[PDB]
């Protein structure tokens, strides 16, 4: 199906959910924490559907459709996705995204039932955090509802009161934290901006200046944007809808559509039929966006295809859409090309990118720092037993590369021509950062002191990635052979830039 990073979240089956490894004897839960991307969402703005509608109107005028039925089908799919996004709101969570996080929060309580029941009895607290963006906060409140209905409401009174709540209403429980959940941009989702001179400002500012001005990234994206296999996929994909004469004139630069009311450059702001720009600002497109090639049209249609997978629940009633009919059979191979072009932009800008640099993923260091600092606060006598964070793909992708999670361990060649491809790299948007992708840490501890050292026993940590138990990077030594539990001291050592292990001292 090739949904790239619009892949809907696949929950663990009852076999996976009940086979998480048990901690070594004597250790019990003291803390858990998570970072999750927001769930499935609609279109970010009136763009892909708007531009293709302009192209469809031209092809209607010029007789460029292959048939009347094909054209009526094309127009009705476009009007359907646009109506669905207008009713749901552009850029907002869909019902599928709410269900994804509801289930994730349900299972989060079930996996640490002993910890949370004890916290309910003993005055422990739960911390909810968000980037500030509506999508992340709303995914959070659905997670929290699943958490509470799984626990029968016994933890509702145990929520830490934020000092900067996401909103006055249902997001009243969520602390805004753009320094660990939005570290990639100077401007924050809530309209504030990072403060010049602070480290969070420097991290976001340096990153944006790097990606904007790096020559290898731009050279590679230009190489992939002119790849002949992508161009042939574009033509064949559009060849099901438009006539070869229409496509020949588009490939010869005789056509061009801007995201305006008439398609021309001199048009004004284009807004989605039935939407209010004061309620729905994103329901109105940026006029600079255009379709100049077969590649643009094809990619816009592919984006409708993958977002339609996200809007499953909204696809009933009078205005339904069926974009998957354009990607059946051997056209699935064409979808593979478009998925690679989409993945490539993410790989080079937010993932491991090319070898010889760490600027694209070192921006995730504040979030890894907070992962370790909240553990430290808990072992040092704090009462927060859980921290649940909700952010974006722009948060998870560098975080996965920074830790070296499966799929984010291979950088592309330092070259503008020998570029990242599906043939030479494991990275895939659908597995690295699906919708509602999440990373969870469980932290256990053993009571008493460790005789022959004046100290308490080190806590141990186990990691779930999209609710799959995974080991840490290979440079890290686990507490025993074949184990996925790691001492906290070891992870402090091996997750730093040196990637050095503590050796025998990492073992229980
Ligand atoms: Zn809440
Ligand atoms: Zn609440
Ligand atoms: Zn660029
Ligand atoms: Zn093909
Ligand atoms: Zn062509
Ligand atoms: Zn053809
Ligand atoms: Zn309707
Ligand atoms: Zn780019």
Numbering used by the authors: 8 to 515
Paper text:
The multiple inositol polyphosphate phosphatases (MINPPs) constitute a distinct evolutionary group within clade 2 of the histidine phosphatase superfamily. In keeping with previously reported crystal structures of HP2P family members, the structure of BlMINPP consists of two domains, an α/β-domain and an α-domain. The catalytic center of BlMINPP consists of the nucleophilic histidine (His-45), three arginine residues (Arg-44, Arg-48, and Arg-142), which coordinate the scissile phosphate during catalysis, and the amino acid triplet HAE (residues 339-401) where the glutamic acid residue acts as the presumed proton donor during catalysis.
To this end, crystals of the apoenzyme and of an inactive mutant in which the presumed catalytic proton donor Glu-401 was replaced by a glutamine (E401Q) were prepared, the latter in an attempt to trap the catalytic phosphohistidine intermediate. The structures of the apoenzyme and product complex were solved at 1.65 and 1.71 Å resolution, respectively, whereas a data set collected at 2.40 Å resolution from a crystal of the inactive E401Q mutant yielded a structure of the His-45 phosphohistidine derivative. It also forms a weaker interaction with Arg-44. Taken together, these snapshots suggest a mechanism whereby the enzyme undergoes a complex structural catalytic cycle during which the lid closes on binding of substrate, then opens fully to expel the first stage product (a lower phosphorylated inositol).
